[PDB]
Amino acid sequence: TSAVLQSGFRKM
Amino acid sequence: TSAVLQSGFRKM
Amino acid sequence: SGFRKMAFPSGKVEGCMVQVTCGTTTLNGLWLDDVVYCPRHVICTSEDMLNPNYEDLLIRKSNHNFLVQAGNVQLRVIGHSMQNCVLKLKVDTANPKTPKYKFVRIQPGQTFSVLACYNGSPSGVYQCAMRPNFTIKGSFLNGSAGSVGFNIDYDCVSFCYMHHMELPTGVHAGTDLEGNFYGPFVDRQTAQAAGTDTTITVNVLAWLYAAVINGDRWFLNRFTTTLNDFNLVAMKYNYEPLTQDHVDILGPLSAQTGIAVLDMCASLKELLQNGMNGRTILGSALLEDEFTPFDVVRQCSGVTF
Amino acid sequence: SGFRKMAFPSGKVEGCMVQVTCGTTTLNGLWLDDVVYCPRHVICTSEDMLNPNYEDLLIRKSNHNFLVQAGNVQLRVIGHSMQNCVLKLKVDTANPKTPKYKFVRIQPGQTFSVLACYNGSPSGVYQCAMRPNFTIKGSFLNGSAGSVGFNIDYDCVSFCYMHHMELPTGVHAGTDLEGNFYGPFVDRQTAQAAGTDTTITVNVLAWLYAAVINGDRWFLNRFTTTLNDFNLVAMKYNYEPLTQDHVDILGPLSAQTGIAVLDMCASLKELLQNGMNGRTILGSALLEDEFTPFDVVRQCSGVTF
Structure with missing residues (x-):
C-alpha cells in the first residue's frame, strides 16, 4: 500500500 | 487518612 | 488515522x-x-x-x-x-494577555483539559473527564492548587475547574471558577470519601464509534437491544444509565459509521458480560470513557481553534 | 498522586x-x-x-x-x-512570538508532545513516543503535515519531530527539524511499510516504578532475574532487549523505590506471563511503554517549565 503525504487541498 | 489541600510551602 | x-x-x-x-x-x-x-x-x-x-x-x-x-x-x-x-x-493592572473567556460549570461525564501549574508556571497539560462522582483522576502534587481546567468553544476559553485538594484514594477534587465545589467535598484536611464511581456509558459508546472509524470492528454483532434492557445490565456493572438524550447526541456518529446506537449498545452489553475476548480496542484493554461524542467528532474531523 | x-x-x-x-x-x-x-x-x-x-x-x-x-x-x-x-x-519579518528554542534529534523510546495543526491553526495537543520501528502512533489527518513534536524541559523548546506522512497501518513518519527522516522512510507516495513494532522495555519498567511510587505494589514478587534470562523472556513477547545502559538509566528510580532493577524485571516477566487478571496499573490494563524514566521523575518529583 502507498504511503500518504498528509498535505491538504486548498481552492485557488 | 485525611485529604490534602495541595498548596505548596515557600520559604519567605 | x-x-x-x-x-x-x-x-x-x-x-x-x-x-x-x-x-x-x-x-x-x-x-x-x-x-x-x-x-x-x-x-x-x-x-x-x-x-x-x-x-x-x-x-x-x-x-x-x-x-x-x-x-x-x-x-x-x-x-x-x-x-x-x-x-x-x-x-491594579489588567492582564494584557486576557483571552476571550467565560466561566462555565460542567456536568459529570464531560471532559476538559487540565493545565497543571507550580509556582505560577505551567508544567503540563492533560485531558481528563469529570467522573460521575464529581472527582478528577488527575496528576497533582503539592503546589498544584490553583491549576485550572478548561474547554475551548469556538474561539472562547471556557474555564470550568480550579484544583484544590487530593482525596485519600488519590483522586482529586476542586471547584468551578465561581468557587462552587464539584461533589460533596469541603476544603479542609479531614477524612473525606467520594461516592461510588461509575463508568460514563455514553462516552464508551462514542469511543467505540471512534474505533470503528479507525477500523476496529471485531466487537460488532448482528444484535440490537433496548434502553431498558441495556440499563438493567449496565447498572449491574456500575455503568451510568443511558438516556434518550445520550442516543440523540450520538446521532452524528451513528449516521457516519452506519451503526445504530442500540446496535452499538448490544456490542457494549456483550463486552460487559464476556469481556473483550482477549483483544484490544484502539490500543486499550479497557473500555475508555474519557471521550465525549463531541470529542470524537472533533478529533476525527480536525476541528481547529 | x-x-x-x-x-x-x-x-x-x-x-x-x-x-x-x-x-x-x-x-x-x-x-x-x-x-x-x-x-x-x-x-x-x-x-x-x-x-x-x-x-x-x-x-x-x-x-x-x-x-x-x-x-x-x-x-x-x-x-x-x-x-x-x-x-x-x-x-521579511522575524516572528515576535519566537521562543528560546533548539533543534534536537531523538532516539526510539524518547517521548515528546505533538501539537496537531490544520491550516496553521492548532487542533489539539497529545503525548507520544518514537517507536523502535521509527514511527509514531499519532492522530493525523490530511493537512496535518507540518505539525511538530517537541519537549520544553526547563526554559527551552526542543523541536524534535516534524510530521510528513501516514503509513498503511495508520502509524506516522516524519523528520527532525533538519529534514532527516526517522527510519528508512521517504517522502514519496510509493509503497512503504513499517517494520514489526516492539515494546520499549525500559519505559515499561520506568512506568512500573511510577506505579510503586504511587502506592501500587500488587505486581511485585520475591524473585530476581539475570539480565540475560529477562531478555530471553522479553523477546518472546516482542519486547525490546534491555541493555546495561538501560539498567543504569533506571538506577535513580530503583534507588528511590528501594527495588533493584533486576527485581523489577522479574515482576515484569510475571506480568507478561499472567496478565493483570482484572486489575489495573495506574488506570490501564496494558503495560504502558510511552513514559521514559525522565518522564517518571518529572511527573512524580518536580514539575516546572
Missing part, C-alpha cells in the same frame, strides 16, 4: 497563570482582566487546614498580605474578597 | 504555527525568527508525489509561489532553500 487523548491547546490559558503567596503558603492563581482567582485556602497555615474558619482567617488579612507574581513582576493587590471557595484579588 | 499522559504546555509552539500554501497544496509551517520550516512536499501537486524530483521542483519555484499566512497577516517570502526533506522559506 489514529486516535489519541487530545487536550486543547493551552496557549491562551498559559498567559493567565500567576503565583499567589500568603505567608509561606503558595499556589497558582488565574489572572483575568484585573482580578486574580485562586483557592481560598492560600490564607491557611499548616495548622489552620484541619478546621479552618475562612471567614475569620480572611478578616485578619489585608491587601498587603498577598504576594501576586506574574513572572518577574509583582502585581499590586488593591482589593480582596471571597466568593465560595475561591479568593478574588483585585490588582 | 496520580499519573497521567502529560504533554508540555503548547503555547510556545502555537505562536510559531503558520499556513504554507504552494499552488493548491497546503500544510503547516513552523515560523522561527525570519525562517519558516515546512515539509518540502508542499511544492508537489497531485501527480508529482510518486517520484518527485524535489531539487528540480524547487528550482522551478519563485518566492511569490509560496503563500505564508500567520493568522490574518500574509508573510512576504524573500528566499527559499531546501535542507533534506524540510523546506526553509525566508520571510
Whole structure:
C-alpha cells in the first residue's frame, strides 16, 4: 500500500 | 487518612 | 488515522497563570482582566487546614498580605474578597494577555483539559473527564492548587475547574471558577470519601464509534437491544444509565459509521458480560470513557481553534 | 498522586504555527525568527508525489509561489532553500512570538508532545513516543503535515519531530527539524511499510516504578532475574532487549523505590506471563511503554517549565 503525504487541498 | 489541600510551602 | 487523548491547546490559558503567596503558603492563581482567582485556602497555615474558619482567617488579612507574581513582576493587590471557595484579588493592572473567556460549570461525564501549574508556571497539560462522582483522576502534587481546567468553544476559553485538594484514594477534587465545589467535598484536611464511581456509558459508546472509524470492528454483532434492557445490565456493572438524550447526541456518529446506537449498545452489553475476548480496542484493554461524542467528532474531523 | 499522559504546555509552539500554501497544496509551517520550516512536499501537486524530483521542483519555484499566512497577516517570502526533506522559506519579518528554542534529534523510546495543526491553526495537543520501528502512533489527518513534536524541559523548546506522512497501518513518519527522516522512510507516495513494532522495555519498567511510587505494589514478587534470562523472556513477547545502559538509566528510580532493577524485571516477566487478571496499573490494563524514566521523575518529583 502507498504511503500518504498528509498535505491538504486548498481552492485557488 | 485525611485529604490534602495541595498548596505548596515557600520559604519567605 | 489514529486516535489519541487530545487536550486543547493551552496557549491562551498559559498567559493567565500567576503565583499567589500568603505567608509561606503558595499556589497558582488565574489572572483575568484585573482580578486574580485562586483557592481560598492560600490564607491557611499548616495548622489552620484541619478546621479552618475562612471567614475569620480572611478578616485578619489585608491587601498587603498577598504576594501576586506574574513572572518577574509583582502585581499590586488593591482589593480582596471571597466568593465560595475561591479568593478574588483585585490588582491594579489588567492582564494584557486576557483571552476571550467565560466561566462555565460542567456536568459529570464531560471532559476538559487540565493545565497543571507550580509556582505560577505551567508544567503540563492533560485531558481528563469529570467522573460521575464529581472527582478528577488527575496528576497533582503539592503546589498544584490553583491549576485550572478548561474547554475551548469556538474561539472562547471556557474555564470550568480550579484544583484544590487530593482525596485519600488519590483522586482529586476542586471547584468551578465561581468557587462552587464539584461533589460533596469541603476544603479542609479531614477524612473525606467520594461516592461510588461509575463508568460514563455514553462516552464508551462514542469511543467505540471512534474505533470503528479507525477500523476496529471485531466487537460488532448482528444484535440490537433496548434502553431498558441495556440499563438493567449496565447498572449491574456500575455503568451510568443511558438516556434518550445520550442516543440523540450520538446521532452524528451513528449516521457516519452506519451503526445504530442500540446496535452499538448490544456490542457494549456483550463486552460487559464476556469481556473483550482477549483483544484490544484502539490500543486499550479497557473500555475508555474519557471521550465525549463531541470529542470524537472533533478529533476525527480536525476541528481547529 | 496520580499519573497521567502529560504533554508540555503548547503555547510556545502555537505562536510559531503558520499556513504554507504552494499552488493548491497546503500544510503547516513552523515560523522561527525570519525562517519558516515546512515539509518540502508542499511544492508537489497531485501527480508529482510518486517520484518527485524535489531539487528540480524547487528550482522551478519563485518566492511569490509560496503563500505564508500567520493568522490574518500574509508573510512576504524573500528566499527559499531546501535542507533534506524540510523546506526553509525566508520571510521579511522575524516572528515576535519566537521562543528560546533548539533543534534536537531523538532516539526510539524518547517521548515528546505533538501539537496537531490544520491550516496553521492548532487542533489539539497529545503525548507520544518514537517507536523502535521509527514511527509514531499519532492522530493525523490530511493537512496535518507540518505539525511538530517537541519537549520544553526547563526554559527551552526542543523541536524534535516534524510530521510528513501516514503509513498503511495508520502509524506516522516524519523528520527532525533538519529534514532527516526517522527510519528508512521517504517522502514519496510509493509503497512503504513499517517494520514489526516492539515494546520499549525500559519505559515499561520506568512506568512500573511510577506505579510503586504511587502506592501500587500488587505486581511485585520475591524473585530476581539475570539480565540475560529477562531478555530471553522479553523477546518472546516482542519486547525490546534491555541493555546495561538501560539498567543504569533506571538506577535513580530503583534507588528511590528501594527495588533493584533486576527485581523489577522479574515482576515484569510475571506480568507478561499472567496478565493483570482484572486489575489495573495506574488506570490501564496494558503495560504502558510511552513514559521514559525522565518522564517518571518529572511527573512524580518536580514539575516546572
